[PDB]
Design a protein around this ligand. Structure first.
Ligand SMILES: *[C@@H]1O[C@H](CO)[C@@H](O[C@@H]2O[C@H](CO)[C@@H](O)[C@H](O)[C@H]2NC(C)=O)[C@H](O)[C@H]1NC(C)=O
Ligand SMILES: *[C@@H]1O[C@H](CO)[C@@H](O)[C@H](O)[C@H]1NC(C)=O
Ligand SMILES: *[C@@H]1O[C@H](CO)[C@@H](O)[C@H](O)[C@H]1NC(C)=O
Ligand SMILES: *[C@@H]1O[C@H](CO)[C@@H](O)[C@H](O)[C@H]1NC(C)=O
Ligand SMILES: *[C@@H]1O[C@H](CO)[C@@H](O)[C@H](O)[C@H]1NC(C)=O
Ligand SMILES: *[C@@H]1O[C@H](CO)[C@@H](O)[C@H](O)[C@H]1NC(C)=O
Ligand SMILES: *[C@@H]1O[C@H](CO)[C@@H](O)[C@H](O)[C@H]1NC(C)=O
Ligand SMILES: *[C@@H]1O[C@H](CO)[C@@H](O)[C@H](O)[C@H]1NC(C)=O
Ligand SMILES: *[C@@H]1O[C@H](CO)[C@@H](O)[C@H](O)[C@H]1NC(C)=O
Ligand SMILES: *[C@@H]1O[C@H](CO)[C@@H](O)[C@H](O)[C@H]1NC(C)=O
Ligand SMILES: *[C@@H]1O[C@H](CO)[C@@H](O)[C@H](O)[C@H]1NC(C)=O
Ligand SMILES: *[C@@H]1O[C@H](CO)[C@@H](O)[C@H](O)[C@H]1NC(C)=O
Ligand SMILES: *[C@@H]1O[C@H](CO)[C@@H](O)[C@H](O)[C@H]1NC(C)=O
Ligand SMILES: *[C@@H]1O[C@H](CO)[C@@H](O)[C@H](O)[C@H]1NC(C)=O
Ligand SMILES: *[C@@H]1O[C@H](CO)[C@@H](O)[C@H](O)[C@H]1NC(C)=O
Ligand SMILES: *[C@@H]1O[C@H](CO)[C@@H](O)[C@H](O)[C@H]1NC(C)=O
Ligand SMILES: *[C@@H]1O[C@H](CO)[C@@H](O)[C@H](O)[C@H]1NC(C)=O
Lengths: 363, 786, 198, 49
């Protein structure tokens, strides 16, 4: 019926039809995080006695600690909380490299000026954000808590009479050091599982590897720039990564006119991961192997054919022809004494149907 | 004072493990063969510093880095000693031989690399290669401009360079190539290999840069500069080109001038009545002409379509050799540097263009010459002289034809998105492009099997040669299968030995295995040897091989007695030709380049398709998992859409080129099937179809994705001059030869066949009478014996 | 009906391509709707162009794919038509010596017929049927002279020798009108004693 | 002046293809202008991308 749906017909002529793809689904989810519990000093940044001016913003480096952004984004005191290139919901799941904390005080009209690609005196002279800015800015009302908050106007401090926190990350390749409240999970091997390792997720098979990783190396990569290995965050062991089995599925059918039995071939898939026959083209299920050789009926691959014959589907190695030994010798010749007149039909296409498409009217 | 750095100052660019891969990386490196100062004094830092020290007694202790180094600035200070490595800044950290170090400041962090290797007793930096492994990294974010060392130590300066690193079997880099060192190294970087085969490779693009900026406005003004590539601004006309005075006659109201393709090629000065001809600045390709790296490291550089005067203007001292040198040659293809002009015409070795070819010849160097079309010859033509061969040579020629490709099926959905429900749902909105691509690939895959079957499966029975190999003295053992050893012949084994699944990519096995193809080839050979061409028309009719060869000489126009009298010589010539074919196949591997070209093309296209999955395509990242885990669904549908668009375009391009290549391979397979039908299953009378000469017969052999035809032909060898006449007069009646020509040495007239001197006495059996002697031009007097 | 598959295959491919091109019109291609009328009715002109551009890009891509596939298919059909014209010239207008160019066996003639978007050739050929074994010699040795057959081969029905044409057993008495002399009997390998009637 | 048509057809086809490829540079493709310099010096860096 899947073949019928693919062909959009209630009857299928004999042959082999590719219907869909077979993929091994992951078994369980693995989260492997370093056993580090010290909390990041977010209180020292969000509860400081005072903040510096816009032209003298202070930076605090956050590393080697577990960060809890849930407390940050669950507080209604923050008037403005918008994040670019990252999601506050997924902040806890994500594990970063080096979290930065920039603190300065600006007026309400300049709050929107703290954004990538925004022009103005404040952005062009005091604090500019990169065009590829990862991280975000947090602001809240501070009029309750006074001329020590200056603003530079020329590039020249023209002081006059909102507390702002900026966070920055870089999730490209560097080893992760600031993880969230995610918990570690035991490690399993030799089974297609969903794995998480310090932030990058994937699905595959983790096995023991003999790769000679250098002490500073964190993971491996193949020729095609694919993550082939990894280092356990909690143990110095090195785990390979192999994709779960996948392939195409083909249906060998004798024709719904003749019969309804079918054979299923999983192309390139070993018979273990799937009246079961293993061929060089894949695993053949539903066809019985026959040691006899016949003319090819339905090709499968690597010299294997399928046929509906005594009545069941059989798979065999094709016979190339009928054997013949010419009675060759140095003084014998074979000469015909008769003949036959043969008429043979040959068909050749000569032309197609001429079509013209009006691009404007079609589009 | 100064010394050569050789190949020192290279480190691991990152923590990613790699193995058995050549990786190209752009990073701050120490250029190869640079000048490193040999030495307490304060030194600049620039973008980076390389360090070395052959301290036998380890006199050198530590380092200082900073800007002013005393107050008002923060300074880094390392007092690495024999007990504890101490680093201070705010920040505190506690942790004959040749010691190397690298210091750099890529915005944040202060990276340190090191290496400790033994050396012999030498003064300068040793040769060989070594790798620098990072030791510590300091996230300080400090500005450093000068530094000091707290007794012979070398100091080098890093530069932003592109390198090609060769990772060994286990994570270690064995060799490196500096791309900007010289044209050979740039060719190596372009080809992504450490060896370069002989040829000419278009490596770079040469462009002349503007010298200044011109702003012109009617009565911000600048003087008008002509006759040089200058950036101009004529009342808002932004462009770059060479300004020259024009003979054009602009109408007073016209301010611009455009050509057919709507490009501004003339301009009017706002402040004057001057009309200036805008000419684009010089540009073109830069190709490197090299012999094999196995032979020499010398190269020549061809700048395509430029004069030899602009190539100095718009690098390492190694490249400056290839800009001047008095060797400078001008050709219609462009400017050659590094090749001598000899004006002696030789056969083409490496083409350049306009009849110019380059070669590596003897002190050996690269010479540029005008290619020779061939050796001159003047045929001694006269109205009564004929050249007739008195001997012959049996020639065996090899013809190679591709028949099929590798059957690759690309999983469309898994390639584009891959284990992603959101991405698959988004891709569902694009219609049936995906099914179209799958159907096209499946059609190509089926066509490959059809091609192979139509070329090889042409025999109705599987013929077996008799165990007694009494083939008139001919020796087919090198082409017949060997049961005692595949079951492939010697030549087939030579051919197969010579010629040599993730991301939704699958390779389908061919329907016919190599053993089956060899069985077809063996059946064809046995049928041809034991029956001739009778097995291609009906049932195989046995005939002795000597009589079959007599048949084939009769077919090419030579009588049977020639074979029956030179049977041993012809057999020896055929055996020697087969042995020469075997020796050539064993020695050289350039003959099989037609199948290797197809294999390389398919592999390169598939590799490009794979590598296109790493492209950003304007998104946050090229990883759908990263995009999904980083962004919320309402805002993650833009990056995923960009990735879908890019991957779909790449897949469509791959499928289109695959279709075109499949058409080419189908044409090749049709030609191969036609040659099998006509050259192998019969004797062809079409000239130069089954080899050069008079086609006697042919033999098929199987090769990976192709067939090889051994074309046995007949070639006349030793001509001799004779006097000839169109007809002879005997009794007032003209006589013409029944089959052949009339010849005379110097006294007597005979009649002989055309392709082999065999004179018979002129007879009424050899000649026929027609007409009178007063009409034929050139008739001669002689006698005909009855 | 599977003998005429080639023309039916061409018709099916063309119809499938046209049908897929038509069905590609009812696709969003990222836009909110796949119909310009509803897009324009729902959205204002400043922001309707955003969806109109997506529809334009998708439809242009589909049209370009269709045209390129048609070009490749037309190149294939041109090659087939050139082959058909060559067969027309070489097999109907003449008798061809090329092996297997027009049928299996020795070509005698061919007849053309017209089929929808194609041509059909009826190839009349000659096929030898019932072979027999004979003893043969490269040449026959008369009194000091080696005789070779002018046209055919020597055969023996056990006791006597005749000369016959290659493709049909028509034995004839060996005579000087059937054979020609060239050299003596020593050089030829496999020569056989016999007599030649003069 | 019509016997040598095939070669003239090839030359004309190649020249027309090159001319169309060059002419496409003046096309707008939905942007505000076909001049890259105008696009650069008419909008801010992020919106000009
Ligand atoms: C040569 O072949 C033809 C055709 O195969 C033979 O003719 C047949 O002979 C049988 C027996 O006499 C008849 O029953 C058939 O009716 C004949 N067929 C036709 C089409 O005439 C013929 O006998 C064979 N032998 C010779 C010597 O001609
Ligand atoms: C984390 O786990 C590893 C392996 O079990 C262990 O060696 C290490 O001591 C643990 N970390 C701490 C802080 O105990
Ligand atoms: C398939 O799996 C079996 C069992 O692990 C193994 O013996 C075999 O080598 C694998 N491959 C094939 C092609 O059978
Ligand atoms: C087929 O051959 C295999 C290999 O010799 C043998 O094990 C098997 O029993 C045979 N089966 C039949 C039905 O002959
Ligand atoms: C690792 O690579 C080196 C080459 O540097 C090689 O000699 C060695 O055999 C490889 N394997 C091991 C286990 O060292
Ligand atoms: C080199 O310059 C001359 C004039 O100085 C010019 O005629 C010639 O075309 C130029 N060479 C090339 C390859 O354009
Ligand atoms: C070729 O170059 C040589 C330079 O040594 C010169 O003597 C000779 O005349 C040149 N030949 C021609 C035909 O110009
Ligand atoms: C013909 O050439 C062969 C060798 O190629 C040798 O017998 C001799 O040179 C020639 N034979 C005669 C009879 O002239
Ligand atoms: C045929 O050639 C092979 C190798 O060239 C040789 O071993 C063999 O003896 C030859 N055949 C005869 C009958 O001498
Ligand atoms: C025939 O004569 C011409 C001119 O006399 C001469 O060049 C040629 O070598 C002669 N041929 C032979 C085979 O000697
Ligand atoms: C020419 O050939 C004939 C052959 O019978 C011979 O008698 C005669 O001497 C030859 N003459 C010359 C000049 O070679
Ligand atoms: C060949 O040409 C020469 C040149 O005039 C002429 O004298 C001679 O008669 C011609 N011979 C024949 C046989 O035509
Ligand atoms: C040939 O002989 C005839 C009769 O003897 C004579 O008329 C004629 O002139 C001769 N031809 C030549 C070219 O001498
Ligand atoms: C000819 O002789 C061979 C071997 O003796 C035999 O197999 C065959 O049947 C005979 N007849 C024909 C027509 O080949
Ligand atoms: C061979 O043929 C001849 C002539 O047809 C005949 O006289 C003779 O008897 C035949 N011999 C045999 C053995 O058939
Ligand atoms: C044919 O070969 C055999 C060897 O089996 C040999 O005895 C016989 O003499 C050969 N035929 C001739 C006519 O020499
Ligand atoms: C052929 O006949 C000749 C002469 O009569 C004789 O010498 C020779 O031996 C004969 N050969 C055979 C094989 O009978």
């Amino acid at each position: 019926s899947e073949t019928k749906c693919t062909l959009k017909s209630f009857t299928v002529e004999k042959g082999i039809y590719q219907t869909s793809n077979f993929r091994v689904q992951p078994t369980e989810s693995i989260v492997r995080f370093p056993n580090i519990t010290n909390l990041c000093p977010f209180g020292e940044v969000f509860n400081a006695t005072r903040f510096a001016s816009v032209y003298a913003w202070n930076r605090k480096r956050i590393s080697n600690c577990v960060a809890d952004y849930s407390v940050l984004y669950n507080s209604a005191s923050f008037s403005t909380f918008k994040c670019y290139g990252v999601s506050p919901t997924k902040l806890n799941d994500l594990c970063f490299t080096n979290v930065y904390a920039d603190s300065f005080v600006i007026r309400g009209d300049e709050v929107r000026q703290i954004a990538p690609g925004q022009t103005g005196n404040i952005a062009d002279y005091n604090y500019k954000l990169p065009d590829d800015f990862t991280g975000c800015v947090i602001a809240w009302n501070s009029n309750n808590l006074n001329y020590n908050y200056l603003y530079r106007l020329f590039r020249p401090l023209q002081s006059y009479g909102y507390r702002v926190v900026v966070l920055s990350f870089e999730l490209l390749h560097a080893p992760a050091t600031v993880c969230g409240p995610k918990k570690s999970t035991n490690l399993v091997k030799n089974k297609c599982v969903n794995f998480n390792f310090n932030g990058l997720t994937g699905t595959g098979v983790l096995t023991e590897s003999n790769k000679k990783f250098l002490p500073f190396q964190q993971f491996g990569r193949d020729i095609a720039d694919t993550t082939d290995a990894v280092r356990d965050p909690q143990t110095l062991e090195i785990l390979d990564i192999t994709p779960c089995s996948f392939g195409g599925v083909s249906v060998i059918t004798p024709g719904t006119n003749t019969s309804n039995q079918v054979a299923v071939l999983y192309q390139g898939v070993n018979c273990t991961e799937v009246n079961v026959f293993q061929t060089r083209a894949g695993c053949l299920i539903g066809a019985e192997h026959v040691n006899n050789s016949y003319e090819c009926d339905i090709p499968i691959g690597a010299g294997i054919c399928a046929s509906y014959q005594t009545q069941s589907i059989i798979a065999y190695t094709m016979s190339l022809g009928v054997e013949n030994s010419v009675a060759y010798s140095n003084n014998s010749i074979a000469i015909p004494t008769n003949f036959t007149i043969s008429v043979t039909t040959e068909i050749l296409p000569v032309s197609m149907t001429k079509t013209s498409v009006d691009c404007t009217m079609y589009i | 004072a100064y010394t050569n750095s050789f190949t020192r100052g290279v480190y691991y660019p990152d923590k990613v493990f790699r193995s058995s891969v050549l990786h190209s990386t752009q990073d701050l490196f120490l250029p190869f063969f640079s000048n490193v100062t040999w030495f307490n004094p304060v030194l600049p830092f620039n973008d980076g510093v390389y360090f070395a020290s052959t301290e036998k007694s380890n006199i050198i202790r530590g380092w200082i880095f900073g800007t002013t180094l005393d107050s008002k600035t923060q300074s880094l200070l390392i007092v690495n000693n024999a007990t504890n490595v101490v680093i201070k800044v705010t920040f505190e950290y506690v942790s004959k031989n040749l010691r190397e170090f690298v210091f750099k400041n890529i915005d944040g962090y202060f990276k340190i690399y090191s290496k400790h290797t033994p050396i012999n007793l030498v003064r300068g930096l040793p040769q060989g290669f070594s790798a620098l492994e990072p030791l510590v990294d300091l996230p300080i974010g400090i500005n450093i401009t000068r530094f000091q060392t707290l007794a012979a130590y070398y100091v080098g300066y890093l530069q932003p360079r592109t390198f090609l690193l060769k990772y060994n079997e286990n994570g270690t880099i064995t060799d490196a190539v500096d791309c900007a060192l010289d044209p050979l190294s740039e060719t190596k970087c372009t080809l992504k290999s450490f060896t370069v085969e002989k040829g000419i490779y278009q490596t770079s693009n040469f462009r002349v840069q503007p010298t200044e900026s011109i702003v012109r406005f009617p009565n911000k003004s600048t003087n008008l500069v002509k006759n040089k590539c200058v950036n101009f601004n004529f009342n808002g006309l932004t462009g770059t080109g060479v300004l020259t005075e024009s003979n054009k006659k602009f109408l007073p109201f016209q301010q611009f001038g455009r050509d057919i393709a709507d490009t501004t090629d003339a301009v009017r000065d706002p402040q004057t009545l001057e009309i200036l001809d805008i000419t684009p600045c010089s540009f073109g390709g830069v190709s490197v002409i090299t012999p094999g790296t196995n032979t020499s490291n010398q190269v020549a550089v061809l700048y395509q379509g430029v004069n030899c005067t602009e190539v100095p203007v718009a690098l390492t001292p190694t490249w400056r050799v290839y800009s001047t040198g008095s060797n400078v040659f001008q050709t219609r293809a462009g400017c050659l540097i590094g090749a001598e002009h000899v004006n002696n015409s030789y056969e083409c070795d490496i083409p350049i263009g306009a009849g110019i070819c380059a070669s590596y010849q003897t002190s050996q160097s690269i010479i540029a010459y005008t290619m020779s079309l061939g050796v001159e010859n003047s045929v001694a033509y006269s109205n009564n002289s004929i050249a007739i061969p008195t001997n012959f040579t049996i020639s065996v020629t090899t013809e190679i034809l591709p028949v099929s490709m590798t059957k690759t099926s690309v999983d469309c959905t898994m390639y584009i998105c891959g284990d992603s429900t959101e991405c698959s749902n988004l891709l569902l909105q694009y219609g049936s492009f995906c099914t179209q691509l799958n159907r096209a690939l499946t059609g190509i895959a089926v066509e490959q099997d059809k091609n192979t079957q139509e070329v090889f499966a042409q025999v109705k029975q599987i013929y077996k040669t008799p165990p007694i190999k009494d083939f008139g003295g001919f020796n087919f053992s090198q082409i017949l299968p060997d049961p005692s050893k595949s079951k492939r012949s010697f030549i087939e084994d030579l051919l197969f030995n010579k010629v040599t699944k993730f991301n939704g990519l699958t390779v389908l096995p061919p329907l016919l295995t190599d053993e089956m193809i060899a069985q077809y080839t063996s059946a064809l050979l046995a049928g041809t040897i034991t029956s001739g061409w009778t097995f291609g028309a009906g049932a195989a009719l046995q005939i002795p091989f000597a009589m079959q060869m007599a048949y084939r000489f009769n077919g090419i126009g030579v009588t049977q007695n020639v074979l029956y009298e030179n049977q041993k010589l012809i057999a020896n010539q055929f055996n020697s030709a087969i042995g020469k074919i075997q020796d050539s196949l064993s020695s050289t591997a350039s003959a099989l380049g037609k199948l290797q070209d197809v294999v390389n093309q398919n592999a390169q296209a598939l590799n490009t398709l794979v590598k296109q999955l790493s492209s950003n395509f304007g998104a946050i990242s090229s990883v759908l998992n990263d995009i999904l885990s980083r962004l919320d669904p309402p805002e993650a549908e833009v990056q995923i859409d960009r990735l879908i668009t890019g991957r779909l375009q790449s897949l469509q391009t791959y499928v289109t080129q695959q279709l075109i290549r499949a058409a080419e391979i189908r044409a090749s397979a049709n030609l191969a099937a036609t040659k099998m039908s006509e050259c192998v299953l019969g004797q062809s009378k079409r000239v130069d179809f089954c080899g050069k000469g008079y086609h006697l017969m042919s033999f098929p052999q199987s090769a990976p994705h192709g067939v090889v035809f051994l074309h046995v032909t007949y070639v006349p060898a030793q001509e001799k001059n004779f006097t000839t006449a169109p007809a002879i007069c005997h009794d007032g009646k003209a006589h013409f030869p029944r089959e052949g020509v009339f010849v005379s040495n110097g006294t007597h007239w005979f009649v002989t066949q055309r392709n082999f001197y065999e004179p018979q006495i002129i007879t009424t059996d050899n000649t026929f009478v027609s007409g009178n002697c007063d009409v034929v031009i050139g008739i001669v007097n002689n006698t005909v014996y009855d």
